[PDB]
Amino acid sequence: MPILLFLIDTSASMNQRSHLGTTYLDTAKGAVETFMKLRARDPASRGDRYMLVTFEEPPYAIKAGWKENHATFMNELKNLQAEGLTTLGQSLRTAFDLLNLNRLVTGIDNYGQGRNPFFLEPAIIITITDGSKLTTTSGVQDELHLPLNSPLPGSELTKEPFRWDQRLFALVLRLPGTMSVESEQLTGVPLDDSAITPMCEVTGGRSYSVCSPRMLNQCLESLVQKVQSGVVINFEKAGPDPSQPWHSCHKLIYVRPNVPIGHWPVPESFWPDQNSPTLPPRTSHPVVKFSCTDCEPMVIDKLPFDKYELEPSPLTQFILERKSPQTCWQVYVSNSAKYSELGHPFGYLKASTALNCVNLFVMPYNYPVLLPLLDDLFKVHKPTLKWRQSFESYLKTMPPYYLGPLKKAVRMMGAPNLIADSMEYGLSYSVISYLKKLSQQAKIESDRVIGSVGKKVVQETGIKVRSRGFQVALLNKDLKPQTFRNAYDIPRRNLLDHLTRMRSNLLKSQVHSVPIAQMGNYQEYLKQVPSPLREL
Amino acid sequence: XXXXXXXXXXXXXXXXXXXXXXXXXXXXXXXXXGVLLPSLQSALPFLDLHGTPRLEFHQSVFDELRDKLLERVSAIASAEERYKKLEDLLEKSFSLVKMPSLQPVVMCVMKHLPKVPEKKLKLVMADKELYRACAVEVKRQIWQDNQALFGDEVSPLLKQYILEKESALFSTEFFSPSPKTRRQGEVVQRLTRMVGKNVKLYDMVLQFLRTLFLRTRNVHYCTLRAELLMSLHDLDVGEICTVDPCHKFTWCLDACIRERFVDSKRARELQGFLDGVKKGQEQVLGDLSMILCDPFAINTLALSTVRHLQELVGQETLPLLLLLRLLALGQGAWDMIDSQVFKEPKMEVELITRFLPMLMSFLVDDYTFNPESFTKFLQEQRMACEVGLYYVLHIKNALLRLLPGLVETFGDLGDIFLHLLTGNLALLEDFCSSLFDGFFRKENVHRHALR
C-alpha cells in the first residue's frame, strides 16, 4: 500500500494572498483535500497511508507519520500555521528520514544481496511550496542543499537521502495577486525553475508550476495519475546509437503485485568479496546501461523470470518508434563482474508484441551463457561432467547473491539437488554483524521517532525581559481559565456576575464550547441517548 | 498405457459405452470391473454413505500389495525353484511393459540369474527406448550384449581424462598425493556401474579403455585400470581379481609402492613376478600398459629411484635395488606407442652411472659445504632418468651449485610442469626458482600462481 507524504511549506512566505483572496497555505491545504478526493475516486486506494511533514523544527516537523489515523492527519492539516522559515533542505531530510527509518529494521533495502524490485515500499513526497528563497536564519541560500549532520544509522550505504521507491514531486504555487488573462493555460504544465526542481528530477519526479486554480486542478489530476507502485531505474546508453534525450532517463518501472512476487535481483554495482569489511555505497537508482545493438529474447519453459513494464518515457518512445518487438536491447549494470568493468547482461528491454509498452525482463546474471546451457540439460538429460565443468565456469562468474535465487529457481524448475543447492557463503561476517547492529539501532530510532510525533512536543514562550532571567507571561492558547476554582481568573469587569454565578453553583439553587466538529455529532449523541420504542 | 488383457478389457468397455443409450450397460461394466469372493459388494455401502472414493481404495490396495510384499518377492528371489519362480514372474510381468512396472521390473531384476535372451532383446530395446530403472542387470545385459556399455565406459573414460586435465591445470601446493583408499572418486561410481561378478564384460571394458588410452589417448589413461583394480580388490571382487593371474599381484605391488614408496620386499616381489611372467602378448603387454599408464605409480617409482640413488650414494656402491628401479622404469616408460611383443630395451649402464655420479658429487658438495656437462648429457639423453634427477634436485653451497644445473636442465627439456610445481612447493633460492620458471598454458598459469 502506498505512502502519500505531504511536505507542506509552513514558511511565512506562504501567507501570500492570491486573486482568490486566500493565502498560499490555504491553497496548499485545499490542494491536499482535493488530491485526497481524487485519490479516493480510485477504488484501489482502500489502503493508503497519508503523512504530513512541515518546515518547523524536527521536534515539531513530523505532524503525522506512521501509526497516525486519518482523523489526526486531517486535524493537523487544518491547523497548520505558516510562521516559519523556508528550511527546505532540513525538511526534505526529515521527510526522507521518516520514509527510510524502517528500512533497516525490516530489511527492504536488501543490502549486499542484490537490488530486488519486488522489495519496495512505494512512497511519493508531494511538497507544496512557493518560489520564495530558502532561508536558514543567516541569509538566503539560492541553492538546495540537504544537510548531512546527524545521519541515521546506515545512511552511508546508499549515499543519497532518497531511495529506490521514492519520488519527490513539487507543487510550486505561483498564483499572482491579480488574475492574469490567459488562453494558453490549457496546455501542458511547465516545469518550475526553483531549487526544488533538480532535486525532484533526480528522484524520478518533477516540479509543477501552477499559476491558476484550473492549472492547480490539472496538476493535482496529473499527481493522482502518478501514484504508482514501482522503483526508479536510471537507464544509460552504453554503446553508440543503433546528445539525444533518450540517452539518460530516471524512468519508473512498474511492480505489479498479485504482495509482489519476483525471483531475480538487479545486480549490485560491485563484486562482493569477504575481504572488504565495509559494504560499498550504492546509488539509490541503479545505473543500468542498455546495449543499443539488437539481440534476441531468450526464454525457456517453466522459467522463473520477472517482467517489469516501464512507464512512458522518451526511452520507451524511442524503442517503440523503432518498431521491432521480435528483438531486444540487452541491459547490464557496470562494474558488476569480477573482472570486466562493463559487466554481463542481466536482462533485456523488449517491446511488447502489441507495440504498446516496453517491458524490462530481468534474468539470471549471465543469461546468454546459462539459458542455452540449462536449456540444453533440461532438453537432453542426470547432469554430465562435460556440462558440469561448463556450469562451474558459469558459477565462477556469477555474483554470490544470485546463488539463492538460482537455487530456488532450479528447485521449482524440477532439479532440486543441483550444484546450486550446495552451500551459500554470501557476504563477510563483518558485514552481517554490521547489518544486524544497524537493524537493532534502526529499531531504536524507529520506536524513538514514532513515539515523538504526537503528545511529545509542547511549546511555551516568554518575553525574556532584558537587563538593559525575568520573563513576562503570554496569553496562552491552552489557558483553560478555572474561574470557578481559581478566583484570580475572574476579570474585574464581570466580577459580580461571576460571583453570583459561583454562589448559585455552590448552593443548592466553558460548557457549549464544543470544538465544532463534535457539536453536530449525529451518531454519537443518539448512541449515548436511550433508544425509543418501535412502531406498530 | 498398459495394454494386455486389462488394456483389451478397457478398449472393450470403451467400445461398449460408446453412446447408443444402455444405462444398465454402464452399471454392468462397473459391476464386472470387486476382485474375488464378492464381499466387496457387501463392503461397498459402508463406503458409499460418505462421498464414495473408489480410486482411493484401488490405489490403496495396489500400493499395499506392491510395497508390503516386494520384500517377499526379494526373499523368494534370494535356488532352482526360486529362479524358476522369478522366471515365471518375469514372463507374467513382460506384458506390462507399458504398464507401470517398478515392482514388475524389480521382480525380474531380483531373479535375474537366468538371462532369457529371447525376451531379453525386447527388454533391452524397451529399456533403451524408455530409460528403465534396471541398473545392475541392465548394465550387465548391455555389457554382455553389445558396445552400448562400451560407449558408456568410453564416456566415463573421457570424463576421467577431462578431470585429470583440469586437475593438472588447477595447480596447488606433491603431484596430488593420495593412495587407492582416499582416491575413491570418479571410478567408484564407474566400478558400481560394472557388472560386479562379470569377468568377461569387465575384462572387455578394461581392454577397450586400455586400447583407447594407449593408441589414441594420453598417459592420463591406464591409471583408471589400476584404480578400478584397487577398488575391486577393496570391494571383494574375487572373480575379477582371480581372472587376471598376475594382475592382482602387480596391483598389490602398485598399492604397496603408493603406500610407502620405499620397500625392498616389494621390489623383490615385483622382480619375482616379472621373472616368471608369461609371453609379451598376454599378461606382458597389459602389465607394461599398467606400468606406463600409472601417473601416481610413475611418481612413486621416481621417488623410490631417488631414495635408491641416495642410499647408493651413502653406501658408495654404484655399479640390485638400483638395477630393479632401472628395470621398472624401462618397463613403465612406454608400451602403447607401438603394438608388439613384450620387450624391455633399457638399462643404459654407462649413462646411468654417469648420471648417478653427478648426483653423488652434488650430495658430497652439499655435505662438505654444510654440473653443466651432466645437465647437457641429461638433456641430450634418456629423460626417464632426467625426471628423477629433476625431482631429486627440486626437493647450502651444494644447493647453490645445483641451481645452475637445474637452470641448465630447465632450458634443455609435458610432465615437467608437475615436477616444477613439486620443486616450487618443496622449496635466496626463491629468486633462482623464479628465474628458472621465467626462462621458459598450464606452466605459465602455475608460474603466475606461484608468484
**Using the beta-carbon criterion (under 8 Å), do B166 and A386 form an inter-chain contact?**
no
Give the whole-angstrom CA distance, residue B372 versus residue B358: 10
Measured at the CA of B388, the angle between CA B382 and CA B389, to 5 degrees, comes to 85
Q: Which chain A residues contact residue B170 at CB under 8 A?
A: none
Cβ proximity of A410 and A383 under 8 Å? no
Cα separations in angstroms, B168 against A370, A497, B419: 26, 110, 12
Residue in B with minimal Cα distance to A382: B131
Solving technique: cryo-EM
Cβ proximity of A32 and A77 under 8 Å? yes
| Residue A343: how many other CB atoms lie within 10 Å | 21
Residue A471 grid coordinates: 520573563
Coil/strand/helix, residue A29: helix
Coil/strand/helix, residue A168: strand
Q: How many CB pairs (< 8 A) connect A and B?
A: 10
Give the whole-angstrom CA distance, residue B236 versus residue A373: 40
Closest-CA distance, A267 to chain B, in angstroms, reads 29
Round to the nearest angstrom and report the end-to-end CA distance of chain B: 65
Of the candidates A107, A115, A109, A161, which has an alpha carbon nearest to the alpha carbon of residue A333?
A115
Cα separations in angstroms, B281 against B113, B213, B340, B403: 34, 18, 7, 45
Q: Which chain B residues contact residue A383 at CB under 8 A?
A: none
The alpha-helical segments, DSSP class H, found in B316-371 are 321-331, 349-369
CB-based contact, B163 to chain A, within 8 Å? yes
Of the candidates B166, B119, B71, B395, which has an alpha carbon nearest to the alpha carbon of residue A385?
B166
Give the whole-angstrom CA distance, residue A315 versus residue A325: 15
CB-based contact, B320 to chain A, within 8 Å? no
CB-based contact, B162 to chain A, within 8 Å? yes
Residue B88 grid coordinates: 515365471
Closest-CA distance, A324 to chain B, in angstroms, reads 43
Q: Which chain B residues contact residue A389 at CB under 8 A?
A: 162, 166
Closest-CA distance, B97 to chain A, in angstroms, reads 22
**Using the beta-carbon criterion (under 8 Å), do A385 and B166 form an inter-chain contact?**
no
| Single-letter amino acid code for the residue at B231 | S
Coil/strand/helix, residue B153: helix
Q: Give, as one character, the DSSP assignment of residue B413.
A: -
Coil/strand/helix, residue B190: helix
CB-based contact, B133 to chain A, within 8 Å? no
Cβ proximity of A49 and A124 under 8 Å? no
Residue in the structure block whose three cell numbers are 628423477:
B388
Closest-CA distance, B160 to chain A, in angstroms, reads 9
User: How many residues does the structure list for chain A?
Assistant: 536
CB-based contact, B159 to chain A, within 8 Å? yes
| Strand order from edge to edge, sheet including A207-210 | A62-64, A49-53, A3-8, A123-130, A166-173, A207-210
- The full 3-state SS of A243-266, as one line of letters, equals CCHHHEEEEEEECCCCCCCCCCCE
Give the whole-angstrom CA distance, residue B236 versus residue B195: 13
Give the whole-angstrom CA distance, residue A2 versus residue A122: 5
Q: Which chain A residues contact residue B166 at CB under 8 A?
A: 389
**Using the beta-carbon criterion (under 8 Å), do A384 and B166 form an inter-chain contact?**
no
**Using the beta-carbon criterion (under 8 Å), do B162 and A384 form an inter-chain contact?**
no
Q: Which chain A residues contact residue B132 at CB under 8 A?
A: none
* Paired strand residues for A130: A173
Closest-CA distance, B358 to chain A, in angstroms, reads 45
Cβ proximity of A124 and A205 under 8 Å? yes
Q: Which chain B residues contact residue A384 at CB under 8 A?
A: 155, 159
CB-based contact, B166 to chain A, within 8 Å? yes
Cβ proximity of B293 and B303 under 8 Å? no
Residue B441 grid coordinates: 598454458
* Paired strand residues for A128: A8, A171
Strand pairing category for A3-8 and A123-130: parallel
Cα separations in angstroms, A94 against A55, A91, A198, A449, B6: 9, 5, 18, 11, 78
Give the whole-angstrom CA distance, residue B397 versus residue B124: 70
Residue A420 grid coordinates: 546450486
CA B304 to chain centre: 25
Strand pairing category for A347-351 and A248-254: unpaired
Residue in A with minimal Cα distance to B156: A385
Query: With 0-12 CB in 10 A as exposed, 13-18 as middle and 19+ as buried, what is B407?
Result: middle
Residue A231 grid coordinates: 522503483
Give the whole-angstrom CA distance, residue B213 versus residue B337: 11
Give the whole-angstrom CA distance, residue B209 versus residue A261: 52
**What are residue A166's phi and psi, to 5 degrees?**
-125, 130
Of the candidates A134, A135, A204, A206, which has an alpha carbon nearest to the alpha carbon of residue A163?
A204
Resolution limit in angstroms?
3.6
Ramachandran bin of A430, using left for φ above 0, alpha for ψ from -120 to 50, beta for the remaining angles: alpha
Which residue in B131, B152, B159 has the most chain A C-beta atoms within 10 A of its own C-beta, making it the best mutation to test that interface?
B159
Half-sphere exposure of A492 (CA within 13 A, CB side): 0
* Paired strand residues for B391: none
Cα separations in angstroms, A211 against A33, A101, A168: 19, 36, 20
What's the fold here for domain A4-232+434-448?
Answer: Rossmann fold (3.40.50)
- The full 3-state SS of A82-118, as one line of letters, equals CCECCCHHHHHHHHHHHHHCCHHHHCCCCCCCCECCC
CA dihedral sign of residues A407, A409, A411, A414: negative
Chain A residues with a Cβ under 8 Å from any Cβ in chain B = 384-386, 389
**Using the beta-carbon criterion (under 8 Å), do B162 and A385 form an inter-chain contact?**
yes
Of the candidates A192, A188, A194, A185, which has an alpha carbon nearest to the alpha carbon of residue A212?
A185
Using CA atoms of A395, A401, A406, A408 in order, give the dihedral in degrees to the nearest 10: 150
Cα separations in angstroms, A480 against A164, A476, A492, A506, A510: 48, 9, 18, 20, 9
Residue in A with minimal Cα distance to B162: A386
Q: Which chain B residues contact residue A385 at CB under 8 A?
A: 159, 162-163
User: How many residues does the structure list for chain B?
Assistant: 451
Q: Give, as one character, the DSSP assignment of residue A112.
A: T
